[PDB]
Amino acid sequence: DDGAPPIMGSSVYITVELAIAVLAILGNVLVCWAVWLNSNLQNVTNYFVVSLAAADILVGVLAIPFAITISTGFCAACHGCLFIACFVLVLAQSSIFSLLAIAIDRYIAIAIPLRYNGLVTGTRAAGIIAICWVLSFAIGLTPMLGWNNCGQPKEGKAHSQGCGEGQVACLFEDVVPMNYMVYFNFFACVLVPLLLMLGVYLRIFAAARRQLADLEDNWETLNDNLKVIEKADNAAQVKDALTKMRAAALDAQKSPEMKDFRHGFDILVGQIDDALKLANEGKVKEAQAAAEQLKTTRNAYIQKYLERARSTLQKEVHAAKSAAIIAGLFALCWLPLHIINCFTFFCPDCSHAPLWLMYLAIVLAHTNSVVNPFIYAYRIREFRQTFRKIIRSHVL
Ligand SMILES: CC(C)CCC[C@@H](C)[C@H]1CC[C@H]2[C@@H]3CC=C4C[C@@H](O)CC[C@]4(C)[C@H]3CC[C@]12C
Numbered sequence: 134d135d136g137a138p139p140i141m142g143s144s145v146y147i148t149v150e151l152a153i154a155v156l157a158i159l160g161n162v163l164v165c166w167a168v169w170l171n172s173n174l175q176n177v178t179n180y181f182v183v184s185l186a187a188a189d190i191l192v193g194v195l196a197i198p199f200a201i202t203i204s205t206g207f208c209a210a211c212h213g214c215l216f217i218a219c220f221v222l223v224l225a226q227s228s229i230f231s232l233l234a235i236a237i238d239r240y241i242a243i244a245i246p247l248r249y250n251g252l253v254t255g256t257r258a259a260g261i262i263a264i265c266w267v268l269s270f271a272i273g274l275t276p277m278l279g280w281n282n283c284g285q286p287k288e289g290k291a292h293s294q295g296c297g298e299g300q301v302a303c304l305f306e307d308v309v310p311m312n313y314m315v316y317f318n319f320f321a322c323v324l325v326p327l328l329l330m331l332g333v334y335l336r337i338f339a340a341a342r343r344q345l346a347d348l349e350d351n352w353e354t355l356n357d358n359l360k361v362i363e364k365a366d367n368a369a370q371v372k373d374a375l376t377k378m379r380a381a382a383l384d385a386q387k388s389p390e391m392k393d394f395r396h397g398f399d400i401l402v403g404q405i406d407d408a409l410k411l412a413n414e415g416k417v418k419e420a421q422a423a424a425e426q427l428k429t430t431r432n433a434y435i436q437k438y439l440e441r442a443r444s445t446l447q448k449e450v451h452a453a454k455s456a457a458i459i460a461g462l463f464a465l466c467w468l469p470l471h472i473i474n475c476f477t478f479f480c481p482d483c484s485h486a487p488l489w490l491m492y493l494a495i496v497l498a499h500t501n502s503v504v505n506p507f508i509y510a511y512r513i514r515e516f517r518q519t520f521r522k523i524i525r526s527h528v529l
């Protein structure tokens with residue numbers, strides 16, 4: 134006994150865990166309360182947010198008390214010890230599924246918006262959420278099915294602590310096999326899905342980049358070909374430019390504001406047709422004058438359509454970044470503990486990470502259950518405004 138009494142360091146760890154638990158419950162209860170109250174927040178994307186918040190509420194209510202209990206090494210039946218050690222794996226896996234669903238949902242919205250509402254529905258989302266929770270319990274509790282160290286209990290540690298028959302000193306790394314934690318949980322169930330999310334978000338931002346560039350190209354094609362018509366010398370040159378503009382207009386043609394965008398393209402294709410007939414009749418001056426009327430349609434309809442399409446794309450990029458930040462923070466908070474397990478497993482010649490670092494890595498992982506409500510409040514106005522209403526009306 135040359136080191137400080139364990140209860141002193143335990144007290145700091147336990148106090149910090151309890152602080153994290155309270156904060157995890159408060160913030161994520163607020164998220165669930167906001168979606169339940171505000172119909173503007175009731176969409177498929179946010180149903181996975183609620184599932185994610187539910188997992189974080191359970192981290193504070195169950196996983197953290199379990200972790201505190203594990204840190205004492207109390208005597209326990211091995212499979213009972215195994216359950217409280219593995220339950221957080223269930224919650225982490227649920228978080229992964231929810232995060233992956235959110236990325237996929239945002240990809241469907243950007244890649245095929247015209248058939249998003251018919252493909253992604255609330256009833257289908259609720260069923261997916263239920264399946265993912267079942268799979269999370271199956272994956273997280275796999276050690277309960279026999280992939281555990283309960284067959285080889287550390288009897289020396291058990292006897293030294295005065296444990297009874299069939300009991301062990303309940304310690305995470307004594308009951309949960311490290312090949313499970315590294316190969317099965319980390320590589321297969323955590324790292325691979327996180328890498329898939331990375332690929333999905335790369336496809337989301339690439340798709341958004343491509344669609345914003347295409348919009349700016351059509352706007353340039355319309356204006357360039359208008360100049361070609363104005364400076365044309367014969368009717369054939371006017372026809373060639375008008376033939377291009379017509380195909381582009383019909384290509385760009387694929388609520389009150391929407392009622393005026395449909396009326397705008399009807400004027401545009403009609404005005405292109407009028408000029409195209411004049412050009413085919415060899416009336417070059419009549420065609421140019423008719424083409425000049427397109428500027429009026431451009432100023433009153435086409436330019437406004439371009440700006441709303443651009444605004445909508447930029448809002449999707451902003452939302453996709455918010456979702457990517459959530460997934461990235463999950464990786465940042467959990468990777469240290471995973472990396473420590475890799476050193477324990479792959480470097481038997483390395484000294485085990487010290488107890489204080491284990492505490493720090495565990496606290497960091499649990500802090501992930503606190504951060505999501507802040508991301509929503511800082512990056513999503515509808516959440517921010519709803520949070521204020523709830524706070525001003527019920528807390529204050
Ligand atoms: C739905 C929620 C509220 C129910 C919570 C039930 C939890 C707390 C229960 C369910 C199973 C229980 C465990 C089952 C078996 C054992 C083995 C025993 O030697 C020590 C206690 C221990 C480890 C129990 C601790 C408490 C426990 C984890």
Ligand SMILES: CC(C)CCC[C@@H](C)[C@H]1CC[C@H]2[C@@H]3CC=C4C[C@@H](O)CC[C@]4(C)[C@H]3CC[C@]12C
Nearest residue numbers: 464465468469470472473476483484485486487
């Ligand atoms: C960006 C984030 C996710 C990376 C964090 C990496 C952390 C977890 C890495 C960086 C350096 C690593 C340490 C480097 C050296 C040792 C000494 C060895 O005897 C036990 C493991 C231990 C103590 C490692 C534990 C994990 C460690 C602390």
Ligand SMILES: CC(C)CCC[C@@H](C)[C@H]1CC[C@H]2[C@@H]3CC=C4C[C@@H](O)CC[C@]4(C)[C@H]3CC[C@]12C
Nearest residue numbers: 324464468471472473475476477478479480483
């Ligand atoms: C893309 C990133 C975030 C994925 C994480 C990569 C992980 C798996 C990498 C990063 C650092 C790596 C460790 C670096 C050093 C050692 C010490 C060596 O004696 C055994 C392997 C071990 C323990 C490596 C295992 C794998 C490792 C933990």
Ligand SMILES: CCCCC#Cc1nc(N)c2nc(-c3cccs3)n([C@@H]3OC[C@@H](O)[C@H]3O)c2n1
Nearest residue numbers: 200203204221222305306470471491492495498
């Ligand atoms: C020594 C500190 C107190 C006793 C302990 C431990 C301990 N040792 C580990 N090697 C470990 N690895 C994990 C992982 C679960 C999912 C991914 S990594 N955990 C659990 O993850 C956060 C907490 O819930 C904790 O119980 C771990 N706990």
Ligand SMILES: CCCCCCCC/C=C\CCCCCCCC(=O)OC[C@H](O)CO
Nearest residue numbers: 142145146149488489492493496497500504
């Ligand atoms: C957003 C990412 C997370 C941001 C938040 C930072 C993450 C850490 C959390 C709280 C401070 C850490 C408190 C440290 C408590 C663990 C150390 C401990 O228990 O001390 C052991 C003792 O000193 C000898 O055993």
Ligand SMILES: CCCCCCCC/C=C\CCCCCCCC(=O)OC[C@H](O)CO
Nearest residue numbers: 139140143144147151155201202204205206
């Ligand atoms: C949401 C409302 C708040 C409810 C939550 C607040 C009430 C719980 C308070 C304290 C629990 C303290 C946990 C006791 C665990 C002590 C373990 C200990 O000290 O022993 C360590 C071991 O013996 C050597 O490593």
Ligand SMILES: CCCCCCCC/C=C\CCCCCCCC(=O)OC[C@H](O)CO
Nearest residue numbers: 209210211212213214215216217220277299
């Ligand atoms: C809001 C409250 C609603 C919450 C919903 C509650 C529904 C729980 C249903 C079944 C739990 C079955 C118990 C599972 C935990 C026990 C694990 C177990 O039995 O293993 C320990 C073993 O006995 C060691 O010897």
Ligand SMILES: CCCCCCCC/C=C\CCCCCCCC(=O)OC[C@H](O)CO
Nearest residue numbers: 212213263266267270271272274275277278
């Ligand atoms: C939406 C809610 C979803 C929840 C749906 C639940 C799905 C559970 C599926 C697989 C886990 C089964 C793991 C096996 C549990 C075994 C516990 C047990 O009894 O083993 C200890 C033994 O009794 C002492 O030797």
Ligand SMILES: CCCCCCCC/C=C\CCCCCCCC(=O)O
Nearest residue numbers: 169175180183184187255259263266
């Ligand atoms: C014992 C297995 C059966 C358990 C029943 C399922 C568990 C229920 C868990 C949480 C209930 C909250 C579900 C979300 C409510 C949303 C309300 C709505 O759809 O409008």
Ligand SMILES: CCCCCCCC/C=C\CCCCCCCC(=O)O
Nearest residue numbers: 194195197198199202207208209217
């Ligand atoms: C509202 C949901 C409430 C859930 C309660 C969870 C809090 C309890 C957490 C862990 C239980 C600790 C079990 C410790 C067993 C010690 C018995 C012994 O000394 O052998």
Ligand SMILES: CCCCCCCC/C=C\CCCCCCCC(=O)O
Nearest residue numbers: 193194195198199201202205207208
């Ligand atoms: C909603 C909160 C859920 C209830 C949690 C209550 C807070 C208790 C926190 C940790 C419990 C730890 C109990 C000690 C484990 C057994 C240690 C021993 O046997 O010596």
Ligand SMILES: CCCCCCCC/C=C\CCCCCCCC(=O)O
Nearest residue numbers: 149152153500503504507508511512
């Ligand atoms: C011991 C208690 C530990 C508390 C952990 C810290 C909690 C802070 C929560 C979230 C931090 C991130 C909030 C800022 C996100 C801004 C989003 C953005 O604008 O890009």
Ligand code: NA
Nearest residue numbers: 188189228502
């Ligand atoms: Na989580």
